[PDB]
Amino acid sequence: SDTVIERHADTAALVAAAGDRLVDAISSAIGERGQATIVLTGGGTGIGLLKRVRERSGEIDWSKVHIYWGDERFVPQDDDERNDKQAREALLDHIGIPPVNVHAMAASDGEFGDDLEAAAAGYAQLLSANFDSSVPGFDVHLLGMGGEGHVNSLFPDTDAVRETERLVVGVSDSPKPPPRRITLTLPAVQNSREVWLVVSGEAKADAVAAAVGGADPVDIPAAGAVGRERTVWLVDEAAAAKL
Numbered sequence: 001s002d003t004v005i006e007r008h009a010d011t012a013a014l015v016a017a018a019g020d021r022l023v024d025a026i027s028s029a030i031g032e033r034g035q036a037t038i039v040l041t042g043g044g045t046g047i048g049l050l051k052r053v054r055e056r057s058g059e060i061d062w063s064k065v066h067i068y069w070g071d072e073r074f075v076p077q078d079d080d081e082r083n084d085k086q087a088r089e090a091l092l093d094h095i096g097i098p099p100v101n102v103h104a105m106a107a108s109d110g111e112f113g114d115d116l117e118a119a120a121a122g123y124a125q126l127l128s129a130n131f132d133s134s135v136p137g138f139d140v141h142l143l144g145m146g147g148e149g150h151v152n153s154l155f156p157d158t159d160a161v162r163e164t165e166r167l168v169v170g171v172s173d174s175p176k177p178p179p180r181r182i183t184l185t186l187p188a189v190q191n192s193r194e195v196w197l198v199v200s201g202e203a204k205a206d207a208v209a210a211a212v213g214g215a216d217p218v219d220i221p222a223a224g225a226v227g228r229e230r231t232v233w234l235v236d237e238a239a240a241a242k243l
Contacts, residue, residue, distance in 0.1 A: 004232040007240050011200040015045055018198045018234045019052025022140065025061060025194070029139040030064050036139050037066040037130070039184070041152075042083035043144035045198045047213075050090040062097040068127070070141060070189070071152035074107035074116050074170070074180040081178055082107065104165045105182045116170035119181045124168040127184075131167075131191060141184075141192040141227070146176075149207040149220030152189070153181035159187060161221045183210060186217060186224040195227040202238040209242035 006021075008014040020037070029036035040046070073081045080086075084104040103126060106112050106119035107198060130136060143151045153171045154161040160169050160183055167188040171181040189195060199208055210220045212233065217224030225231070 001226060001228060002230045004230055004242070005212070005243065006232065006234050008236050009236070010236050010238075011045065014198065014200055014234060014236045015048040016052050016194045018045070018049040018196070020056070021234065022049060022053055022142075022234075023195075025058050025140050028204060030061065031081060033135055035066065035135065036127075037068070037135075037137070039068045039070050039138050039141040039192070040087050041070050041142040041144050041198075043084065045200050046142060046144045047090050049142075049198060050087055054091045054094055054150045057091070057095045060095075062095045063101070065100075065101060067092070067097070067102045068138065069103075069105050070143060071154075071177050071181055071183040074106070074108050074119065074182055075178050076109045077107035079107075107137050108180070113222045116172055116180055116182070120166075120168045120170040123182060124166055127188060136191070138192040139194065139223070139226075141189055142181060143189075143195060143196045143197045143222070143225055145197050145204060145207060145211070145222045147203040147207055149211055149215075149222045150176075151197070151222045151225045153183035154186065154221040156219055156221060161218055161224075163187070168180045186221075190228070192227045193229045194232055195225050196232040196234055197201070197225060198203060198234045199239045200236045202241060203236075204239040205242040208233065208239050212243060 211222035
């Protein structure tokens, strides 16, 4: 498993390149295997890259694309803090993807009511099916990263980042609002052919360098966000400055 670093001059150029790269990865995966399975992320650059994908959406047959999320805010479905809602407005509402191919994590007014543990366990059941299936794993897991190295809703020192067994857990006390989240764990992230971290800004430079360098994930969660075939850091020059 190689680490690939692709640097772009600024956020705009980064987001455009990441979206392009994803279009090409989806098309390659469909070419090699007849389908593509992608895990989406939240945050500025994560959503921004999807708007670039939208511009090229006519190149892809979306009935052969399967969509998951890496984490989600456990809040009402219509809340603007929802990762799924932002991905739908950026891209998913605008493409011909069967709803059965799209697997949003639950909302707090959803299927499980306000039961966070139940909502995370439901998503774990869903992932268990895929990983035990005929064509298992994710092709690409997209990630943003915070300045303290968090990815998905896996924060430093937490039980979530230490989890070695469950594929998905509830986080009830995120130090960044909102407090309650559903997140894939590192074992789930590591069952991806590629993990792409799309990271912009000087505030992220230390965490990028520490993560590329191989820190303990308990201290820098992004350090454990590694793909089976490769880990791709799509960074701007500011986020790359400590390399």
